[PDB]
PDB file of C-alpha atoms (C1' of nucleotides) and ligand atoms in Angstrom:
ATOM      1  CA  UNK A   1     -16.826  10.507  -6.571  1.00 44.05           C
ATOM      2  CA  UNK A   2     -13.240   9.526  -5.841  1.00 45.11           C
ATOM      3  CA  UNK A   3     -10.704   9.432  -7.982  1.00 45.32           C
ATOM      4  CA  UNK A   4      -7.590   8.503  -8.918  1.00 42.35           C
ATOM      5  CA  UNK A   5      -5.139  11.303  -8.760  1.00 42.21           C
ATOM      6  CA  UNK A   6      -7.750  13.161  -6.202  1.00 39.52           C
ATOM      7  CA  UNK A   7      -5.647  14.695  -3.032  1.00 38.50           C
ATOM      8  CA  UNK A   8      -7.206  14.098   0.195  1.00 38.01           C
ATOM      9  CA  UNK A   9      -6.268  15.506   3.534  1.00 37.39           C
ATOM     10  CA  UNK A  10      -6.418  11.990   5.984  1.00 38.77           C
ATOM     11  CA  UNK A  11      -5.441  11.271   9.370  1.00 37.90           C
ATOM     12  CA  UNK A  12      -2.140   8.058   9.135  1.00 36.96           C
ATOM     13  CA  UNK A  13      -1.935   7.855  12.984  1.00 38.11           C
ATOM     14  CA  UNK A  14      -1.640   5.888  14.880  1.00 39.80           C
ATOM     15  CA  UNK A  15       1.483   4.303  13.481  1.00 38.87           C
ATOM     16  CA  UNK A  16       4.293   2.236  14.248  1.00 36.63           C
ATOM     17  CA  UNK A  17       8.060   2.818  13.384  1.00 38.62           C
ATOM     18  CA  UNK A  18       9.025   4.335  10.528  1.00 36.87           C
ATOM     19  CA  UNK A  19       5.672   4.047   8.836  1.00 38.39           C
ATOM     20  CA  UNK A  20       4.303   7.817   8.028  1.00 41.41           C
ATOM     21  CA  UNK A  21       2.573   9.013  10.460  1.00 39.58           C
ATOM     22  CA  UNK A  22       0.281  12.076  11.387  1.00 40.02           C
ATOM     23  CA  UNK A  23      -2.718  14.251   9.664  1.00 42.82           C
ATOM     24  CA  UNK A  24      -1.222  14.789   5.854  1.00 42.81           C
ATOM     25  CA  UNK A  25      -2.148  15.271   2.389  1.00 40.29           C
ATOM     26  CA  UNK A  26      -2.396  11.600   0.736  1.00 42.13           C
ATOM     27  CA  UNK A  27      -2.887  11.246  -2.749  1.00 39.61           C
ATOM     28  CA  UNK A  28      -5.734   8.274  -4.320  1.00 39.42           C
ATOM     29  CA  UNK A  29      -3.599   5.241  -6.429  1.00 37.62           C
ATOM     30  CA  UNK A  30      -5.889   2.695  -6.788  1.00 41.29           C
ATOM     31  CA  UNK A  31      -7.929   2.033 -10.124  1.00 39.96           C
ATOM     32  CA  UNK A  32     -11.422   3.832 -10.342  1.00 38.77           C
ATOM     33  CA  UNK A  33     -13.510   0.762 -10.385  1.00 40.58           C
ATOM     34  CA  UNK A  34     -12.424   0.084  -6.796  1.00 38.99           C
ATOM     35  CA  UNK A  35     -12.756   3.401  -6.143  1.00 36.18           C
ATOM     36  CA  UNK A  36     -16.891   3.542  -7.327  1.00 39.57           C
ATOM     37  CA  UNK A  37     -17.238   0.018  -5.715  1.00 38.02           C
ATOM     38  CA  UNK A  38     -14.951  -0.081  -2.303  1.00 36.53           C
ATOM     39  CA  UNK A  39     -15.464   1.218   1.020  1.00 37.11           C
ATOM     40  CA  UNK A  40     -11.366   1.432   0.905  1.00 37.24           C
ATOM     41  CA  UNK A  41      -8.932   2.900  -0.940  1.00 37.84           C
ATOM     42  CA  UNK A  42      -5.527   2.914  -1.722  1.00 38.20           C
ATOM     43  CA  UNK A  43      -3.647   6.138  -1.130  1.00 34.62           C
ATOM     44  CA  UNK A  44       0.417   7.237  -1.201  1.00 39.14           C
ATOM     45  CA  UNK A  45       1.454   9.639   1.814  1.00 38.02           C
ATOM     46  CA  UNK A  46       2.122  13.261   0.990  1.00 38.30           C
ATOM     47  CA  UNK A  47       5.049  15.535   3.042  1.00 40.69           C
ATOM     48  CA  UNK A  48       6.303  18.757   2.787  1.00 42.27           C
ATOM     49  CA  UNK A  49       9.817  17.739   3.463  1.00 41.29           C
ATOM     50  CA  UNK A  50      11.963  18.464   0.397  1.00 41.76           C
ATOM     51  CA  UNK A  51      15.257  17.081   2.381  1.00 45.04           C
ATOM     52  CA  UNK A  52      14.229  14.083   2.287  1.00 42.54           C
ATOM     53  CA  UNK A  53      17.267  11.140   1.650  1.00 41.24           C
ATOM     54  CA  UNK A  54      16.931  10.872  -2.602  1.00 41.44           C
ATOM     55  CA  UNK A  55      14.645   7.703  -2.816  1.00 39.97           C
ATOM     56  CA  UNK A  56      14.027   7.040  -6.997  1.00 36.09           C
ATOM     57  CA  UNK A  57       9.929   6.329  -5.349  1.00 37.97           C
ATOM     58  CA  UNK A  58       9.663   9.978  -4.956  1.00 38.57           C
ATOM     59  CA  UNK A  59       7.716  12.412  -6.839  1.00 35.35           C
ATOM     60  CA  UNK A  60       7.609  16.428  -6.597  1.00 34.01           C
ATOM     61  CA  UNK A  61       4.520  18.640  -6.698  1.00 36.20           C
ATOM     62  CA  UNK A  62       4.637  22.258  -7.092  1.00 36.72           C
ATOM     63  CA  UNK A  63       2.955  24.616  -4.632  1.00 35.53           C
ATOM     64  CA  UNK A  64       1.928  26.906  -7.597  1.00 33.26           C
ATOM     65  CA  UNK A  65       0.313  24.274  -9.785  1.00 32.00           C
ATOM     66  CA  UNK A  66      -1.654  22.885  -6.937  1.00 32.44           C
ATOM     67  CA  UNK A  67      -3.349  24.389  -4.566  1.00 31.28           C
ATOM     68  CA  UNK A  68      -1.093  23.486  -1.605  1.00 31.55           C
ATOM     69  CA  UNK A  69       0.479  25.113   1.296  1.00 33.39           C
ATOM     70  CA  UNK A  70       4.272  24.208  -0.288  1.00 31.55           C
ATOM     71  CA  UNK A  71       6.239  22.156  -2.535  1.00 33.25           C
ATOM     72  CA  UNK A  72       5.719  18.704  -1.437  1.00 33.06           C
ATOM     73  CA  UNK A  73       6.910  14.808  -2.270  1.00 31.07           C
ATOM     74  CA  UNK A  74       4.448  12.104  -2.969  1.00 32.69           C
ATOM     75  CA  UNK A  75       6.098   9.139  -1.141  1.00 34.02           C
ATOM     76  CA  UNK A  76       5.523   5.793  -2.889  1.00 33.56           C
ATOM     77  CA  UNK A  77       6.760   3.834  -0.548  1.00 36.09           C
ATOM     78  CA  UNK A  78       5.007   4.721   2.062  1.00 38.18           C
ATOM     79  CA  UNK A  79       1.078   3.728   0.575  1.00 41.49           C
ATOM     80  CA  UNK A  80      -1.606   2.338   2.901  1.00 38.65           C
ATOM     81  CA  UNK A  81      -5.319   0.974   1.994  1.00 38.95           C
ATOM     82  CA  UNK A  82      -7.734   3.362   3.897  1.00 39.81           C
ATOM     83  CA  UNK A  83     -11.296   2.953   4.820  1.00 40.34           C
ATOM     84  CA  UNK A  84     -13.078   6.070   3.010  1.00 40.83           C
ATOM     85  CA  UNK A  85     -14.146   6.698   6.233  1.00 40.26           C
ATOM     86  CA  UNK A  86     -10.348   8.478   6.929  1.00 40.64           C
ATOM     87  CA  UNK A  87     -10.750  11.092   4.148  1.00 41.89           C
ATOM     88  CA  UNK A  88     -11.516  14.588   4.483  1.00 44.01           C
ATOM     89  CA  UNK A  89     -11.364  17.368   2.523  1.00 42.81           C
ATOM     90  CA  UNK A  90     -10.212  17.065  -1.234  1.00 43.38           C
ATOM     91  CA  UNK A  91      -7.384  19.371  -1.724  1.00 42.46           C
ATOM     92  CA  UNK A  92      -6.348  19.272  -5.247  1.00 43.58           C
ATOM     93  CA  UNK A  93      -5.614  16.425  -7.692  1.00 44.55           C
ATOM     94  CA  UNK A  94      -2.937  16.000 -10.339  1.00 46.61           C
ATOM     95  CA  UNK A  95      -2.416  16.128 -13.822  1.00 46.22           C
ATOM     96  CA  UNK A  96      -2.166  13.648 -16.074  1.00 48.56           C
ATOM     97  CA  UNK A  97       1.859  14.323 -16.313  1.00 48.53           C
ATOM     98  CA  UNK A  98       1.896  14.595 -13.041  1.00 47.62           C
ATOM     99  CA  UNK A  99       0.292  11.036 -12.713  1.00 46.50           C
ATOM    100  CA  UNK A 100       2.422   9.408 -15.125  1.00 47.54           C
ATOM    101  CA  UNK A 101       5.230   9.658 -13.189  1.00 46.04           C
ATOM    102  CA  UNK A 102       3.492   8.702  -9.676  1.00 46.25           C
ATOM    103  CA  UNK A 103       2.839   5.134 -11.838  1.00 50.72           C
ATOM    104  CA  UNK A 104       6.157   4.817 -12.759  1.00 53.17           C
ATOM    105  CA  UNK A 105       7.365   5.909  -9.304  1.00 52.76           C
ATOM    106  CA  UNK A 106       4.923   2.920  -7.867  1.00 49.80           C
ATOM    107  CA  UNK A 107       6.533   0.396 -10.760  1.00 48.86           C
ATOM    108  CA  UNK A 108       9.725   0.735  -9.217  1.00 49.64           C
ATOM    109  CA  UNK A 109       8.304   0.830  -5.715  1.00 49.00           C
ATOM    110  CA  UNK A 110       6.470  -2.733  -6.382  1.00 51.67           C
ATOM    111  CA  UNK A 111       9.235  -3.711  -8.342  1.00 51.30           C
ATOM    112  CA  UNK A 112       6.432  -4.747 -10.944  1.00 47.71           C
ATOM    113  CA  UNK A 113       8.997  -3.071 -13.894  1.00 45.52           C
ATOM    114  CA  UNK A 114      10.768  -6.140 -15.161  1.00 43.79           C
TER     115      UNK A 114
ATOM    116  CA  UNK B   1      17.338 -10.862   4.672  1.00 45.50           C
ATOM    117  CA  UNK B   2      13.707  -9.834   3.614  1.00 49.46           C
ATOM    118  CA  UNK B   3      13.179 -10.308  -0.033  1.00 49.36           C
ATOM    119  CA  UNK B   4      10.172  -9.681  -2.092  1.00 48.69           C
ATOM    120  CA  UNK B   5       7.674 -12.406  -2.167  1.00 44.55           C
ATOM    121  CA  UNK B   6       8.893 -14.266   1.481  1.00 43.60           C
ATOM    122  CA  UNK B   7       5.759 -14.485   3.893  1.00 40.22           C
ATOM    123  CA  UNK B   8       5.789 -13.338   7.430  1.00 39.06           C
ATOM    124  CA  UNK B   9       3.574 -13.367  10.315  1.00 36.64           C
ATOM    125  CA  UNK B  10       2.352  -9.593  11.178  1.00 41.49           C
ATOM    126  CA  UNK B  11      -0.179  -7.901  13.095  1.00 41.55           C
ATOM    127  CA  UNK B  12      -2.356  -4.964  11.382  1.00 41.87           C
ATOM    128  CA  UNK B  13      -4.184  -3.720  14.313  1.00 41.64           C
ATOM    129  CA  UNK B  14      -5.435  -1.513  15.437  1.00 37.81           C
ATOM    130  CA  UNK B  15      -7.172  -0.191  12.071  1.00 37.49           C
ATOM    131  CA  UNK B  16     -10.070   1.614  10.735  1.00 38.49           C
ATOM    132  CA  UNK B  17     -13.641   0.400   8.932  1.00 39.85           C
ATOM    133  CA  UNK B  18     -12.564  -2.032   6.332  1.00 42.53           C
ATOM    134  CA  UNK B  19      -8.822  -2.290   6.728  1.00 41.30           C
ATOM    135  CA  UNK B  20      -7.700  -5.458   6.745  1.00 41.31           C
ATOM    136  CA  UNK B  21      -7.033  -6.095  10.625  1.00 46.30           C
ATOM    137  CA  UNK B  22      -5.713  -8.912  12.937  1.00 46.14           C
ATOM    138  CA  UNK B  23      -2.689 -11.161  12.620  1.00 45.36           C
ATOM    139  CA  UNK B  24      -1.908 -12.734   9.758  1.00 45.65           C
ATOM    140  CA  UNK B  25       0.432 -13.566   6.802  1.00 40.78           C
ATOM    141  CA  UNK B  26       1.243 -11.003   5.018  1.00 37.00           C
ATOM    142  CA  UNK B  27       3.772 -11.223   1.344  1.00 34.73           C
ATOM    143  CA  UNK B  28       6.492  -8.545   0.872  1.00 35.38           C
ATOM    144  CA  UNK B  29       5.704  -6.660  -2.554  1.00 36.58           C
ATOM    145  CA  UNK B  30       8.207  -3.885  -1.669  1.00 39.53           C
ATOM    146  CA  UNK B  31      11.421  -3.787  -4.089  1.00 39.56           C
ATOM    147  CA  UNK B  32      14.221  -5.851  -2.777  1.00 39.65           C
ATOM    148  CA  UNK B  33      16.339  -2.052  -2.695  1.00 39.38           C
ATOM    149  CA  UNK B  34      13.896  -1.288  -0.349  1.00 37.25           C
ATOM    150  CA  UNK B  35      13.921  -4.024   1.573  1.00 39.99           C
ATOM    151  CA  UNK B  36      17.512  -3.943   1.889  1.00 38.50           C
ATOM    152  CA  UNK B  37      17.792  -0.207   3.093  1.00 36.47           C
ATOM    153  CA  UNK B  38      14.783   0.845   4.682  1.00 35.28           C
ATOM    154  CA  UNK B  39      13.282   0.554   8.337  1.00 33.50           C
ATOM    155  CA  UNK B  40      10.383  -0.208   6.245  1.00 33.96           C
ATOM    156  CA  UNK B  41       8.675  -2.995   4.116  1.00 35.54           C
ATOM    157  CA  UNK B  42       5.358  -2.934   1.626  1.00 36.09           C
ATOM    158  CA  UNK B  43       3.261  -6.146   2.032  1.00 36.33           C
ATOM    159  CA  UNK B  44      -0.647  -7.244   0.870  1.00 37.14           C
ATOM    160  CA  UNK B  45      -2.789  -8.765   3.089  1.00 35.91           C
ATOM    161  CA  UNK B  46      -3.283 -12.861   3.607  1.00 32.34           C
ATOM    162  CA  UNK B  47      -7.362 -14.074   4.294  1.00 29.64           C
ATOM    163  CA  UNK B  48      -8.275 -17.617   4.705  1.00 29.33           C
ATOM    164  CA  UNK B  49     -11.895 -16.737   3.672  1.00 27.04           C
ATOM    165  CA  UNK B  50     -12.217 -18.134   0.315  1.00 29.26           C
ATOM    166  CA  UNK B  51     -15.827 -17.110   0.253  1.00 29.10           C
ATOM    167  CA  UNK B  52     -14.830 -13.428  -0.140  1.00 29.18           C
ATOM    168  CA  UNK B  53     -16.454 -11.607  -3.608  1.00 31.85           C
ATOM    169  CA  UNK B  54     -14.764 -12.364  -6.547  1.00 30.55           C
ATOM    170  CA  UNK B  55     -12.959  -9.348  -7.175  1.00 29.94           C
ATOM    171  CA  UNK B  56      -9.820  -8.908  -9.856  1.00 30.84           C
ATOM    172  CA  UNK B  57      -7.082  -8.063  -6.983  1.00 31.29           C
ATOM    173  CA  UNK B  58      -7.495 -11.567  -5.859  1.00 29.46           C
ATOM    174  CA  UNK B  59      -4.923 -14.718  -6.059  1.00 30.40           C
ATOM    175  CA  UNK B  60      -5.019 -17.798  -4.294  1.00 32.53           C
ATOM    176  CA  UNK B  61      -2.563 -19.419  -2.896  1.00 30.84           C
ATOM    177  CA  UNK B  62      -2.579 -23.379  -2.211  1.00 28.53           C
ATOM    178  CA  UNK B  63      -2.093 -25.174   1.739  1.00 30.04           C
ATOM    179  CA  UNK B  64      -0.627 -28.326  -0.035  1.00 29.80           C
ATOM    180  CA  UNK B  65       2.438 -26.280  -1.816  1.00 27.19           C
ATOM    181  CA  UNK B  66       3.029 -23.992   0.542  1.00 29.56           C
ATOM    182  CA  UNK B  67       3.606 -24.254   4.268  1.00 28.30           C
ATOM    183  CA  UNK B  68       0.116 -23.034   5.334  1.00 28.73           C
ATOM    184  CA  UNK B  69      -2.745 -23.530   7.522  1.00 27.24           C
ATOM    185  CA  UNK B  70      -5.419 -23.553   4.997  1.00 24.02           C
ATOM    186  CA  UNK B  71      -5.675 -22.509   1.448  1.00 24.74           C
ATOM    187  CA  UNK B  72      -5.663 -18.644   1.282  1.00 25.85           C
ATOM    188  CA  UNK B  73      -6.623 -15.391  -0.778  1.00 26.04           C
ATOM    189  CA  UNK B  74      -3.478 -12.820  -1.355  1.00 26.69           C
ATOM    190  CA  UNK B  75      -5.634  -9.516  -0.950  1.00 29.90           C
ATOM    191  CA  UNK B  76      -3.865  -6.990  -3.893  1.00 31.79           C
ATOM    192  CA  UNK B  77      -6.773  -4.130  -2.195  1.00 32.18           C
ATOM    193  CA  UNK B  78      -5.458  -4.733   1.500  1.00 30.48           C
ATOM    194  CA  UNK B  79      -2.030  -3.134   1.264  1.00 29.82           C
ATOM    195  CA  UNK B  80       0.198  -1.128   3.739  1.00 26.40           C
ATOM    196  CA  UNK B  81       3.838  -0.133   4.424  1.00 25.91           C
ATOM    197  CA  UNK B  82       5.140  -1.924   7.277  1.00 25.10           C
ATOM    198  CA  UNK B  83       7.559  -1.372   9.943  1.00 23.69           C
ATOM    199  CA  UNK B  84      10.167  -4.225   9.866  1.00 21.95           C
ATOM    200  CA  UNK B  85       9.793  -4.651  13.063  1.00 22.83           C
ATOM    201  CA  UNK B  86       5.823  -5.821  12.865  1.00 25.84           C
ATOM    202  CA  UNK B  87       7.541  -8.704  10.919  1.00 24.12           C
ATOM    203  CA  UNK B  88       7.440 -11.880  13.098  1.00 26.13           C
ATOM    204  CA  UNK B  89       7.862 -15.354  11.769  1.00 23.96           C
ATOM    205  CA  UNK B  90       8.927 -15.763   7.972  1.00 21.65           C
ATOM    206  CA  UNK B  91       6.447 -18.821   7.376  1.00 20.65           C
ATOM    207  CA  UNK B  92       7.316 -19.495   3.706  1.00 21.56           C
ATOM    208  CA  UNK B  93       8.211 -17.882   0.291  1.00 22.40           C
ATOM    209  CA  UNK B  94       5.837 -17.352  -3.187  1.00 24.05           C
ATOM    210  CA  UNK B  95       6.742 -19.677  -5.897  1.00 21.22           C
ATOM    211  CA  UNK B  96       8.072 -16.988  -9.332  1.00 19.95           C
ATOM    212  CA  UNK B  97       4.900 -18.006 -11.277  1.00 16.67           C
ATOM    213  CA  UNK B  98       2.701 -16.791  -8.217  1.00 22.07           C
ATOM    214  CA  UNK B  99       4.342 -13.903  -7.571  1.00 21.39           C
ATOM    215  CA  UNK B 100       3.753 -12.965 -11.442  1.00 19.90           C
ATOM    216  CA  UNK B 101       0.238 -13.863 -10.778  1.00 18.02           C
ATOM    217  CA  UNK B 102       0.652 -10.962  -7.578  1.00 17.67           C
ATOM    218  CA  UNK B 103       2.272  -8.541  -9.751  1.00 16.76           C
ATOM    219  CA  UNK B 104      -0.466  -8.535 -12.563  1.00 13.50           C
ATOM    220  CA  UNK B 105      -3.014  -8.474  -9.832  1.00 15.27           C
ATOM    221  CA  UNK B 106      -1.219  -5.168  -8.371  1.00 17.36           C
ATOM    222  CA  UNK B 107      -1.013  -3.584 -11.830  1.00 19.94           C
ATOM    223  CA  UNK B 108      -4.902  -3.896 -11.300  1.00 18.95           C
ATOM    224  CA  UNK B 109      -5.226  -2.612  -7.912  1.00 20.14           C
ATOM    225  CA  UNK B 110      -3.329   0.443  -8.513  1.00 21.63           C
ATOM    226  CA  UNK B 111      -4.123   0.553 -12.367  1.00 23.93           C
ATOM    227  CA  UNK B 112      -0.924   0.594 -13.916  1.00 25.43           C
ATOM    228  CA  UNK B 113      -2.015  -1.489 -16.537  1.00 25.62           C
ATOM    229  CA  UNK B 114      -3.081   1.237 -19.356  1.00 26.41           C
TER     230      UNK B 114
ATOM    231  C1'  DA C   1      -4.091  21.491   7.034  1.00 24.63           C
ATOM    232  C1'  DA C   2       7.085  13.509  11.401  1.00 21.53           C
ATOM    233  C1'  DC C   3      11.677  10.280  11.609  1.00 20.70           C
ATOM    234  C1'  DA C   4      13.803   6.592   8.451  1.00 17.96           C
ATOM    235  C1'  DA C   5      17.812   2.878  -2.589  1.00 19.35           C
TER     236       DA C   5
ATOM    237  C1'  DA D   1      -0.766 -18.479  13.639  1.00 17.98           C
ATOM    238  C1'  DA D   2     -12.195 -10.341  10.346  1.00 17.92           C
ATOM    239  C1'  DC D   3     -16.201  -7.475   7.645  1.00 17.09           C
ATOM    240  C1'  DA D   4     -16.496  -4.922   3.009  1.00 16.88           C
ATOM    241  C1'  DA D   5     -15.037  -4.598  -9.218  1.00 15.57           C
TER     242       DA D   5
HETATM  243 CL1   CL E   1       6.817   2.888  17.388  1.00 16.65          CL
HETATM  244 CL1   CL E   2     -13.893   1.499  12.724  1.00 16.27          CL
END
DNA sequence: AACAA
DNA sequence: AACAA
């Protein structure tokens, strides 16, 4: 089954612009009832750039807690529905702490916090 | 300027299984921050198929009050960060009572609602 | 297992 | 200015 908070490797290309691009760790946002029913998902790209310009829709994760190759930022603003069909291995998925503050990261990316 | 709930002519393609592809409207749910400052926008798919199942990330959106082609389904499941520059025409803007109808429906598809 | 408030 | 809880 997939889950929210499950962390998927998937392929983003091809792309266009600025939107992320490439074979990256993307992490599962939308609610689980699409996620049992849906041949999509909604995920929220992954990097392992921690130089990133400060954006307030970004969210650490730890390489120690997880099992990933380095500390890495969930982007919220950069989220994309993908067919199931684009994920691969399940790397690791996040706590509940963790997850609170991806959903208030997303809030403030939607600007649904008013 | 791009603000959040202004409609614009986009194309999605290429894209994968069930993606949402083709040209279409699409509605800016990105934070107007973010749409101020960033090469990039967030947006949910537009479908004139109003035969589509009846599922919760759904709202309508009426031909009369709006400047549209046919009466059409605001897809909360079909969503993607954007380039600005896959923005064509702005073809018209989301009244403030639909757009709360789009946030609640988001707070579903990414369940933020607990 | 990129670049760009 | 598609298909698929
Ligand atoms: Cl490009
Ligand atoms: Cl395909």
């Amino acid at each position: 089954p997939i889950r929210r908070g499950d962390v998927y490797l998937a392929d983003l290309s091809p792309v266009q612009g600025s939107e992320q691009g490439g074979v990256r760790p993307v992490v599962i946002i939308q609610n689980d009832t699409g996620n049992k029913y849906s041949p999509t998902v909604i995920v929220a790209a992954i990097t392992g750039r921690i130089n990133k310009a400060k954006i307030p829709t970004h969210v650490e994760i730890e390489k120690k807690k997880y099992k990933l190759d380095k500390d890495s930022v969930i982007l919220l603003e950069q989220i994309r529905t993908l067919d199931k069909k684009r994920l691969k291995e399940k790397l690791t998925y996040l706590s509940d702490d963790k997850m609170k503050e991806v959903d208030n990261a997303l809030m403030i990316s939607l600007g649904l916090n008013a």
